[PDB]
């Protein structure tokens, strides 16, 4: 059997897999991190105005 | 290359091992029978991933801004709050071990399992055609030894907490009275409450093993038994699905541990 | 949002626009979100939580009734 | 010789019982999912998420069995 | 020879169970699809969509078993 | 020789399991259909339509089981 | 000839299995019929109509099986 | 010897499954007959009628099986 | 000798299948009976009447199965 | 070998199926009993009497097979 | 000689089926117990009593079967 | 040799039946517990208690069986 | 060869029964989880934890079975 | 499969990663999280006192 061809197919499959990953799975994580940042920023600023 | 796929897969299912007694590497047809023959490749990646975990988390422990957190700090504190919420939902005692234990289990098992998503032949290609060593399979959690080590550790911890928090006078009480509560029945309960307590950790290990081991085997098969131009159409629908496994199989391993410890002490 | 009426035999008690509510129906607690399927039940004496759109939360005590 | 058909039967048992388990379990789960969706039709995207979560456990053991089945069917 | 006895027997037991799974598994589902439609039929096109979404998952393993049975019966003879 | 006897046995297993599946599936589906009409008679036009649409998928696999059972009994045996 | 006896096991299973399903498949269906009747007893015949429709589907595969269950034990035998 | 062993085993299954299908199939149906009766006892007789119409179908394919069992024991020896 | 020592298995199957069938069917029927009795207690004897009425139909087949099993055990084997 | 081990096997089969039937049937009945009792926290005796009646019916036919299993355990073997 | 192994087999069969029956019956019964408890949470000590009453009855035949399987495995084999 | 070979099948059937029974019973009981909790979130700590109580009974018989299975696999070997 | 083939069937039985048990149990439990989530969406988080608690009990014995099956299939091989 | 001395070689690596995580990873992070939480809530307390 052509082992080099089996690695060929593995690489094709992995390229399609990383496509699916970086176009469905990652945006959720980045948006969650950004939501957390917005939350903490707004909390600290609203708490700042309370002092004045 | 004279690989009949039936033998190619067999090679793929072999670990790389070492003789504790003789300091020698294992063979494709030859295994030192004595149990003292460490599985080496998983230890390297295992300890490697635990190192990477502790490194990545200390490198933010010593940068933690209490103001607006950096984008990198946010994710680590996110996972920290995730674990803390689960713990303080299921546990209520004053023990300081539970939370870091849970975080270690969660992230360590997650990174261990995540390995399988990598193409199956790549690192085995390197570790033979560069280092010359005979075999390599990389997923640490895909071996009974490591999951049973974790499971028996958790079992020792369960026993520790059950002794410490209600004493032998109560520990023997739970082990003899429940369920039927009369002394004439103590001999029967002593069986059940034993095997039950034994199944709790053992299944905990095997649950993690069986999922990952077969989860690796599929990829092996997909490599060994289909022509290149087709492999993807059966690799991809599995790989994405495995993302759903590696996460849950980590999460469950965390939660049940808490559920046991909180259940043991309280 | 959806329209919510809290009406007694004597006088009306609430007529705002709501985003969700929570009640203790005779068969258990129960939460109504928009688009909920048509449903009929009795509710036990106790509180009910209204959240008016823009998220304003308030509690109304009911001596029972039918939802 | 006499080995191959006996191994194929050992594989067929696994495949069949795995099909039984996966089909009946996901059928029950999906039935409850659909009676939930018909109740709160605006929360379909939320409940569906939970479904895909719990499905990941229902198909835990079947994909083990199926896997080993293929092994017995092709690797020995 | 003896093989062509059991090579069929297996193909049966695999594809028979694969039927019992696929049929009942969908029926339990389909029932809940109907009782929901029979209350507020205005959602029929909505629920039907979800129905197929989940039914594809039901036929995951049964059709795999049917494929292996066809391979055993025809290709393996 | 022994071949035809166990070929008949295999077809028998296949068709018994297929019958179990088709029967119980269509039974559980029809039970809910017969409930829907009662709640809302006058849409029977419609629930029966959807019931056939679902019955086709319920029977998809048992039909293959029966097809291959006959294929064995009267082409291979 | 051993060929003489195995057929009786191939039939007895089929007409057994087709019996378990075709019974229960109807036993379930008829259930939802009766509790439908007990609610709207003015519609009993109308529901009966649909019942006799749906039952005609439930008995589809079983009547095939029992058919061959005879064919094996009498025509093949 | 064995020629006259198997035909008794072939009966054990045929009347065994035929019992189960008959026992469960009615055990389900009569249950609803009770429920609809308990909600409205003033309606008992009409339900009691419809029941026997449905029941007679359920016991159709089981009873014949049991018959073919007795035959297979006595007249088929 | 095997020609008699093996028929005990036919008897065991023949009557154990009837055991499970009768037990589970009567369990379902009696459960519906008990719920009827619980909802409207001043009805009990009439529901008891109907319960025995159809319980007879439930145990009809298992009884012949058990009788034939006992006959095969004592008289035949 | 062929004499006694098969008798032990037949006794095992009888008693295992008897356990299945009795346990599941009485579980169903007792579940309905506890439901009715929780709905009527004053009719516990009035309902448990009926429960004992119908459960005395249910357990009986498994007990036939259990007694015969003991017979085959210690009177055939 | 080989005689003894099928005694392990018979014990395995009987004990596995007894476990099936006991576990599923107690599952159903305890599920109904918890359903009752959730509604009338103050009546838990009363229902917990009645539960235990029936609790021992479902697992009578399973207990017998497990006892006799221990007999077969450790006393006979 | 079979005294060595067949014991793994003997253990296999015990472990499979223990698994099915424990899983199904605990699933039913836990499902009823989850729905009771969803209907009464404040009673979560109370109902959970009863759960682990009644589950402690359900898990009794299977852990016998599985235990003996291990003994058959490694002790008697 | 002569001795090391049956072992694969022995393991197959373990894994098949464990698959049925785990799958159907977790489905029965998740169905009630989704029903609860549908009645009160805001409790989704809390109920979810109570799921992973109870579910951790469901698949214990099935995973013991799967582990020992993989052992037999790769340690004894 | 092969029950192996690794069952011990892992447990060591386990108990280490637990302790360094306990004593030197978790408190450092949770202290900062609790600090930000308390010092956002203090602003709400200040607003309440301002109204009171």
Author numbering:
A (entry chain Y), N (entry chain X): 1 to 52
B (entry chain a): 4 to 269
C (entry chain H): 3 to 69
D (entry chain R): 3 to 78
E (entry chain M), F (entry chain J), G (entry chain L), H (entry chain Q), I (entry chain I), J (entry chain P), ...: 3 to 79
Q: What do the study's own words say?
A:
A key component in the generation of cellular metabolic energy is the F1Fo ATP synthase, a biological rotary motor that converts the proton motive force (pmf) to adenosine tri-phosphate (ATP) in both oxidative phosphorylation and photophosphorylation. The enzyme is comprised of two rotary motors, termed F1 and Fo, that are coupled together by two stalks: a central “rotor” stalk and a peripheral “stator” stalk. The Fo motor spans the membrane and converts the potential energy from the pmf into mechanical rotation of the central rotor that, in turn, drives conformational changes in the catalytic F1 motor subunits to generate ATP from ADP and inorganic phosphate (Pi). Here we have used cryo-Electron Microscopy (cryo-EM) on detergent-solubilized cysteine free E. coli ATP synthase13 to probe its structure and understand its rotational dynamics and coupling.
The three major rotational states identified previously (termed States: “State 1”, “State 2”, and “State 3”, assigned to describe the enzyme operating in an ATP hydrolysis direction), in which the central stalk is rotated by ~120° relative to peripheral stalk, were also obtained in this study with resolutions of 2.9, 3.1, and 3.0 Å, respectively. Hence, masked classification focused on the Fo stator was used on each of the main states to reveal sub-states describing movements of the complex along with increased detail in the Fo region. Importantly, this rotation describes a ~36° movement of the c-ring in the Fo motor without any corresponding rotation within the F1 motor: the α3β3γεc10 subunits are rotating as a rigid body relative to the Fo stator, with the movement mediated mainly by changes in the peripheral stalk. The focused classifications of States 2 and 3 also revealed sub-states, however these showed only torsional flexing similar to that seen in Sub-states 1 B-E, and hence no movement of the c-ring was observed within sub-states of States 2 and 3. By contrast, in States 2 and 3 the spring is close to its relaxed energy state in the observed single Fo rotary states, and the adjacent Fo rotary states are inaccessible because thermal excitation is insufficient to stretch the spring through the required 1/10 of a revolution. However, the reconstructions were still anisotropic due to preferential alignment to the F1-ATPase, so focused refinement using a mask of the Fo region was performed on Sub-state 3A resulting in a detailed map to 3.3 Å resolution of the Fo motor. When all the density corresponding to protein had been assigned, tube-like non-protein density likely corresponding to lipid molecules were observed in multiple locations within the membrane bound Fo-motor.
